[PDB]
Amino acid sequence: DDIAALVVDNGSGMCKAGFAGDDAPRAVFPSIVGRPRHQGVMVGMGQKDSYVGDEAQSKRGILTLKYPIEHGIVTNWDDMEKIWHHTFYNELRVAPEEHPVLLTEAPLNPKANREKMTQIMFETFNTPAMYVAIQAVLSLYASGRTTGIVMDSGDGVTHTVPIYEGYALPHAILRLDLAGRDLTDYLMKILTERGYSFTTTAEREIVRDIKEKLCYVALDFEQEMATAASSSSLEKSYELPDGQVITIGNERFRCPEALFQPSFLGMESCGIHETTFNSIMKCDVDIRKDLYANTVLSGGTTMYPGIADRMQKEITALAPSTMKIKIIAPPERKYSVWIGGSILASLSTFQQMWISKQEYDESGPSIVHRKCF
Amino acid sequence: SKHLIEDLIIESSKFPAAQPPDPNQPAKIETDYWPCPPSLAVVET
Amino acid sequence: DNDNSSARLFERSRIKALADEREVVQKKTFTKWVNSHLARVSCRITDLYKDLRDGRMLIKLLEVLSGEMLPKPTKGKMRIHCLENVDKALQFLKEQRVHLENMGSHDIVDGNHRLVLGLIWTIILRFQIQ
Amino acid sequence: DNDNSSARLFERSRIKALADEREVVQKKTFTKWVNSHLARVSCRITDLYKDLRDGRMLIKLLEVLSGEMLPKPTKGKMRIHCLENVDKALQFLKEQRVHLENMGSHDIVDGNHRLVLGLIWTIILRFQIQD
Numbered sequence: 001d002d003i004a005a006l007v008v009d010n011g012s013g014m015c016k017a018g019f020a021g022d023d024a025p026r027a028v029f030p031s032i033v034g035r036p037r038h039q040g041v042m043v044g045m046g047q048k049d050s051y052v053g054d055e056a057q058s059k060r061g062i063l064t065l066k067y068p069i070e071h072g073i074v075t076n077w078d079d080m081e082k083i084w085h086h087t088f089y090n091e092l093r094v095a096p097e098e099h100p101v102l103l104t105e106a107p108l109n110p111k112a113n114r115e116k117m118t119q120i121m122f123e124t125f126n127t128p129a130m131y132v133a134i135q136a137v138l139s140l141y142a143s144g145r146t147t148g149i150v151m152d153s154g155d156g157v158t159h160t161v162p163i164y165e166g167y168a169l170p171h172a173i174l175r176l177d178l179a180g181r182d183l184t185d186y187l188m189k190i191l192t193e194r195g196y197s198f199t200t201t202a203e204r205e206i207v208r209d210i211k212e213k214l215c216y217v218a219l220d221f222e223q224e225m226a227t228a229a230s231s232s233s234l235e236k237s238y239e240l241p242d243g244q245v246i247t248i249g250n251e252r253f254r255c256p257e258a259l260f261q262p263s264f265l266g267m268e269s270c271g272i273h274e275t276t277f278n279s280i281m282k283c284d285v286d287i288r289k290d291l292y293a294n295t296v297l298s299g300g301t302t303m304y305p306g307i308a309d310r311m312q313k314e315i316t317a318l319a320p321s322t323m324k325i326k327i328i329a330p331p332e333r334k335y336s337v338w339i340g341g342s343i344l345a346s347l348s349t350f351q352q353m354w355i356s357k358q359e360y361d362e363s364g365p366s367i368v369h370r371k372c373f
Numbered sequence: 374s375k376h377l378i379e380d381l382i383i384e385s386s387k388f389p390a391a392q393p394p395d396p397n398q399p400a401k402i403e404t405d406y407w408p409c410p411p412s413l414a415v416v417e418t
Numbered sequence: 419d420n421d422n423s424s425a426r427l428f429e430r431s432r433i434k435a436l437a438d439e440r441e442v443v444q445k446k447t448f449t450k451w452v453n454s455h456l457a458r459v460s461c462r463i464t465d466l467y468k469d470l471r472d473g474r475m476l477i478k479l480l481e482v483l484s485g486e487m488l489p490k491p492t493k494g495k496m497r498i499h500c501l502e503n504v505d506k507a508l509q510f511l512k513e514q515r516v517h518l519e520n521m522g523s524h525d526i527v528d529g530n531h532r533l534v535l536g537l538i539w540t541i542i543l544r545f546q547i548q
Numbered sequence: 549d550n551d552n553s554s555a556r557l558f559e560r561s562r563i564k565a566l567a568d569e570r571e572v573v574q575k576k577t578f579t580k581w582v583n584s585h586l587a588r589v590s591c592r593i594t595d596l597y598k599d600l601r602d603g604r605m606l607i608k609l610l611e612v613l614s615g616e617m618l619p620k621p622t623k624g625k626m627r628i629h630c631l632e633n634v635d636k637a638l639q640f641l642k643e644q645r646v647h648l649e650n651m652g653s654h655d656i657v658d659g660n661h662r663l664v665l666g667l668i669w670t671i672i673l674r675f676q677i678q679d
């Protein structure tokens with residue numbers, strides 16, 4: 001049989017990698033590059049200049065931590081090369097010269113980004129073939145249905161695309177820059193209100209952990225504010241890494257509520273439910289009925305407990321009464337963008353889709369626009 | 374060429390495990406441990 | 419939180435198992451390779467994670483693979499001499515064009531499975547027996 | 549109104565009755581014909597409409613009739629894998645200069661009665677069978 005291709009999902013927060021045809025990724029690690037801050041007085045220690053991946057997260061106190069990807073755009077490329085090298089040689093122990101590579105991209109972004117990835121992967125890693133696919137198309141592949149609207153939300157970018165019977169509508173693709181990192185920064189700014197202080201890059205990871213453990217989307221916001229003001233039954237206690245104990249309380253559901261009211265961050269954009277409804281409304285009249293019943297959630301940011309009920313309630317409020325709304329939220333949705341990719345490289349006709357080495361050599365790095373959607 | 378000891382280890386690294394899978398065992402897609410739901414026709418039959 | 423529980427459930431099971439089986443078979447193959455290459459001198463490795471911790475095994479492996487002389491390993495039971503012994507082998511790898519990421523001497527000393535497995539895989543792939 | 553009600557009566561009775569009667573008899577005939585060729589690979593179908601959705605029965609029938617082995621079916625139980633297998637069968641049918649129209653993969657997968665019957669009719673009529 002032919003060599004199984006490598007499915008590599010480059011998210012804004014985490015990087016995932018695995019083999020095509022598997023049901024789960026084989027290596028998951030944060031996409032963080034850290035560099036030393038203080039001075040080293042011990043002679044004979046390690047002289048490594050850059051910590052990458054989980055090793056950078058292991059030692060946060062003496063490092064300044066940076067993200068090579070922000071808002072779905074690569075800003076530093078040497079750090080990306082380090083990320084990909086650690087993914088290939090260390091996390092998987094594979095030879096990249098004998099494996100096709102599939103990559104994952106947000107729908108709307110700078111164009112040159114694509115070229116750079118291609119220009120890297122044919123040159124430094126010498127892969128025989130590579131391909132780039134949109135996140136939400138792979139999510140719809142992993143959903144198992146051909147017709148639906150895909151709403152995806154990670155740490156860098158939120159985007160909604162409609163697809164009817166395998167046909168995409170490019171004018172109805174909507175992108176929003178409110179994502180997980182904005183929620184983390186808002187949680188920091190709102191945790192300042194209780195007297196707790198977090199300022200450094202190492203403490204942002206602590207705040208992110210607090211958000212993942214103790215945040216939920218309230219079904220009704222004003223009623224929840226009245227309940228939290230009336231009683232203290234909503235409070236929870238968290239333990240800091242240095243043994244301090246903090247109490248979140250009212251800040252548990254105010255941070256995710258910013259996904260539906262972007263005026264909390266000063267943004268004048270609309271909420272995610274309004275974005276989904278507007279992306280549905282831009283389509284043709286006939287295909288709306290199938291799109292209302294096939295809404296799919298994806299990405300880690302949609303893992304707040306209670307997001308599905310709130311989204312269904314708001315969309316049902318916006319939509320006409322005679323139509324019925326179904327929100328499809330699979331329990332393993334965090335890896336859906338990977339899983340569909342692992343499906344896509346296993347198809348028979350996808351062997352006719354690859355950007356070969358010879359084609360790139362013939363037509364330069366601008367070939368990726370002709371082949372990839 | 375001119376090294377026959379470790380290129381077989383390279384060939385062993387291509388499969389998802391370092392060992393080739395058993396021909397008798399079915400693939401990951403059909404083993405009913407796949408997380409994605411199947412089609413309506415197959416589940417109906 | 420049944421969906422979050424199921425997400426953590428899938429994370430705890432399938433990713434960990436699929437990584438563990440690959441890691442086990444890879445380290446079993448690597449032990450055979452390093453034992454076959456270290457058998458010329460009077461040396462043997464019985465555990466990949468523990469025998470490469472101290473550093474004499476690695477410097478002797480680079481001695482036999484390069485066929486070319488290396489500096490005296492420092493002698494001492496403490497951690498600092500162990501860091502020195504790993505660092506000298508890492509520097510020798512740094513000379514002969516082999517490119518390493520996320521490699522520190524304290525990573526091998528502490529015993530991280532991923533990094534020692536990646537180092538052995540890089541030795542197999544990019545280094546020349548010559 | 550009443551004239552429209554009479555027109556609806558006429559169409560719903562006569563057109564639907566005649567179409568369903570002819571289509572039922574042709575379905576029985578086509579099933580009886582295809583089972584004879586499918587018996588040689590020890591495969592049997594009960595309902596023509598539902599057992600052609602997966603696509604393995606179609607590719608095995610073409611395997612019987614052509615005498616040349618086809619590309620292997622994709623390993624899956626999804627919708628897209630059924631679309632792949634039906635597309636492979638239809639590509640082989642296009643390969644042998646048999647002309648088919650209004651016949652996509654999703655038509656066979658979704659189980660349209662008229663298009664499945666037309667595909668079987670074209671296989672019976674135009675295709676070349678060698679022994």
Ligand SMILES: Nc1ncnc2c1ncn2[C@@H]1O[C@H](COP(=O)(O)OP(=O)(O)O)[C@@H](O)[C@H]1O
Pocket residue numbers: 010011012013014015153154155156180181208211212213215299300301302303304305334422
């Ligand atoms: N269990 C959870 N509950 C709530 N939010 C979560 C949970 N897990 C992750 N998140 C949020 O999702 C983000 C990770 O999303 P991820 O899927 O890594 O995005 P991408 O991979 O597309 O960059 C984290 O920043 C965190 O804010």
